[PDB]
Design a protein around this ligand. Structure first.
Ligand SMILES: O=P(O)(O)O[C@H]1[C@H](OP(=O)(O)O)[C@@H](OP(=O)(O)O)[C@H](OP(=O)(O)O)[C@@H](OP(=O)(O)O)[C@H]1OP(=O)(O)O
Ligand SMILES: Nc1ncnc2c1ncn2[C@@H]1O[C@H](COP(=O)(O)OP(=O)(O)O)[C@@H](O)[C@H]1O
Ligand SMILES: [Mg+2]
Ligand SMILES: [Mg+2]
Ligand SMILES: [Zn+2]
Length: 417
């Protein structure tokens, strides 16, 4: 019911993004075995919903009357995302009461395993009385079948905008993925050391060869897009952050960690694992439905931003001294922006794919598996989406400014012919 200070020692750092700290359970309590706990951070840059937001999510009443942010996320996923992605690959999570000292002790306990820059930016909001308990998707099933190799992919946006509302100076956005353009900026801002090889357009292409190309690229330059876990412990990718190119040292360590699981010859396990992930992702069709949601961003931020100012009743600062978008009835403007924010969730979520050697003694043999040609192995697999966070309405403003910054920096770098 309530987590207490002394329970803190049973949770171990697992990872974090910009919004949450995620800890894996290491204790014995049948309650938490196979779970992770997801804990919101307080951003130092930064009651449950602004007035404009309650206006935005008016169709979803349970969601507007959430007594806290944990319940908000919980109801968002259950009532808005599920009906869109299906419930098979999604877990809304169960709330659990936490005491202030539990939070404080956890924050202090994991501090040293956290990236320095993540610590500078945010800490566990010790003013929340609740956290989220999720199933740990590095564990094959809730409640064994041997080891479990788990892969996390954060696919980003897999389509190009085609908007009538993209300015003349910015048409490159029509040609070059946002992920690719953003790479140049990050490099310029010293957030990464080398541009990623990953092309979201390949992963979402629907082509088996191109999906494998994406997976191979993810492997070489994982950044914050790719991680691999062996029974819940990280063996490739960054811990709470983006990581650098895969070096020979990293390649070897990863190759070794796969022994027994991928039953190929020493030195060849890695290529076999990459083929296995590719088959799993491609065969599950799971990316197609995600892409559909991402494409709820129909007009691009350059279009959607106009509706946003209408929704909040401010004169549009983007138009200066569109006859089209600003002539929309409140109802359509709210729809457009709400879908833009749902798309933003889909653009930033992750997929975790759990693998385990196919178990002949399952009482109902899974329909979902992949046959590895050479090794003569069959693996059952499961896919779950994670990090299906609700994006705050106010973020429409920085989405526009970030976008403007990406395209103009890219334009400038290109003009440097
Ligand atoms: O902190 P980072 O690892 O650099 O990742 C952030 C972070 O995503 P995660 O927290 O899921 O990792 C942002 O989300 P917030 O935590 O700030 O809510 C997200 O911003 P949006 O989802 O609001 O877009 C942003 O995505 P983007 O840069 O595409 O806007 C993304 O950065 P990456 O570009 O590295 O994924
Ligand atoms: N249900 C889960 N099972 C296993 N790992 C998880 C789960 N939820 C989160 N994680 C791990 O913790 C990391 C951070 O979680 P996430 O919800 O993406 O945080 P943020 O909201 O800050 O982006 C994820 O990238 C993933 O590696
Ligand atoms: Mg995340
Ligand atoms: Mg998030
Ligand atoms: Zn306008």
């Amino acid at each position: 019911m309530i987590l207490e200070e002394k329970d803190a020692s049973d949770w171990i750092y697992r990872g974090e993004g910009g919004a949450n700290l995620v800890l894996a359970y290491a204790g014995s309590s049948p309650l938490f075995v196979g779970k992770v706990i997801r804990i919101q951070k307080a951003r130092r840059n930064d009651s449950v919903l602004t007035s404009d937001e309650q206006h935005l999510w008016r169709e979803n009443n349970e969601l507007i009357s959430s007594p806290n942010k944990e319940v908000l996320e919980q109801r968002y996923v259950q009532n808005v995302i599920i009906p869109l992605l299906g419930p098979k690959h999604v877990d809304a999570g169960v709330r659990v009461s936490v005491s202030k000292e539990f939070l404080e002790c956890v924050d202090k306990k994991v501090t040293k395993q956290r990236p320095l820059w993540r610590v500078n930016a945010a800490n566990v909001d010790t003013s929340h009385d609740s956290a989220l308990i999720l199933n740990d998707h590095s564990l094959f099933s809730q409640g064994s079948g041997g080891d479990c190799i788990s892969v996390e992919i954060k696919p980003k946006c897999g389509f190009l905008p085609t908007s009538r509302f993209i300015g003349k100076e910015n048409m490159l956005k029509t040609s070059v993925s946002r992920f690719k353009m953003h790479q140049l900026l990050k490099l310029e801002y010293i957030e990464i050391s080398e541009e990623s090889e990953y092309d979201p357009l390949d992963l979402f292409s629907g082509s088996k060869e191109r999906v494998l190309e994406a997976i191979k690229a993810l492997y070489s330059t994982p950044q914050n897009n790719f991680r691999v876990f062996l029974n819940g412990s990280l063996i490739l990718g960054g811990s709470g952050e983006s990581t650098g190119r895969t070096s020979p040292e990293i390649g070897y360590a990863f190759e070794d960690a796969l022994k027994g699981f991928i039953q190929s010859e020493d030195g060849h396990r890695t290529e076999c694992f990459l083929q296995l992930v590719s088959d799993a992702v491609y065969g599950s069709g799971v990316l197609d439905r995600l892409l559909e949601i991402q494409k709820l961003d129909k007009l691009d931020i350059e279009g959607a931003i106009h509706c946003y100012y209408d929704i909040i009743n401010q004169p549009c600062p983007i138009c200066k001294e569109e006859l089209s978008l600003h002539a929309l009835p409140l109802d359509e403007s709210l729809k457009i922006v709400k879908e833009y924010l749902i798309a933003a969730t889909a653009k930033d979520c992750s997929i975790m794919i759990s693998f385990q050697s196919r178990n002949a003694w399952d009482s109902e043999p899974s329909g979902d598996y992949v046959s590895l040609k050479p090794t003569n192995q069959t693996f059952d697999y499961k896919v779950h989406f994670i990090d299906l966070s609700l994006k705050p309405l106010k973020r429409m403003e920085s989405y526009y400014k970030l976008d403007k910054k990406i395209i103009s920096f890219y334009n400038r770098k290109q003009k440097a012919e």
